[PDB]
């Protein structure tokens, strides 16, 4: 029994978006539903609450003139509409349906990203050849400036970082093996 969600997508700032959530073993008309935003620094933020049996929607007043909550019964689906986006709206958005015996149902996340973007990187090895064999030594490589998401022991891989409206990533351990990407 799942609370299924729509996939991710990208838009430019100033645009407007719609996200979707659908049931699979229940009718969303039975019980209230929430949407919450998540992003690593500011954390989890509740945006609003809908009673799918009618038009009643309750909002956090920071979102009230910018988010909009809707639903449909026959398609068993609720929609969240987002307006006039900025980089501060780049986040993961969850739906939630509460339950009294089990924990409340959450769906798989829906990621949303906004930027004045596509770019495939070039990968740059990081071998200290002019150094010394000193054996107990390490090597690595990096991929520089990519957009929008890219492809055994001894290895460590570091998460991506937005350099400035494009991503960078590196890993440590030339031999690399250890159209989003185009190897």
């Amino acid at each position: 029994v799942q609370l299924q969600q729509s996939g991710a997508e990208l838009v430019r700032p100033g645009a407007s978006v719609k996200l979707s959530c659908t049931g699979s073993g229940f009718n969303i008309k039975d019980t209230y539903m929430h949407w919450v935003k998540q992003r690593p620094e500011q954390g989890l933020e509740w945006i609003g609450r809908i009673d799918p049996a009618n038009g009643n929607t309750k909002y956090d007043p920071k979102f009230q003139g910018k988010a909009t909550m809707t639903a449909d019964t026959s398609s068993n689906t609720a929609y969240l509409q987002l307006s006039s986006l900025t980089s501060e709206d780049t986040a993961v958005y969850y739906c939630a349906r509460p339950d009294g015996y089990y924990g409340d149902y959450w769906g798989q996340g829906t990621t949303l990203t906004v930027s004045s973007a596509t770019t495939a990187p070039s990968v740059y090895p990081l071998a200290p050849v002019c150094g010394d064999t000193t054996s107990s030594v390490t090597l690595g490589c990096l991929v520089k400036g990519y957009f929008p998401p890219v492809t055994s022991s001894g290895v460590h891989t570091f998460p991506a970082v937005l350099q400035s409206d494009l991503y960078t990533l590196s890993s440590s351990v030339i031999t690399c093996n250890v159209a989003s990407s185009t190897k």
Binding site: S122, Y124, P125, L126, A127, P128, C130, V137, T138, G140, K144, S172
Partner: peptide, 15 residues
Amino acid sequence: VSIFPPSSEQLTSGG
């Protein structure tokens, strides 16, 4: 700890 200077592929493309 480890540090590595820029690769020739960078300098031959400005980086």
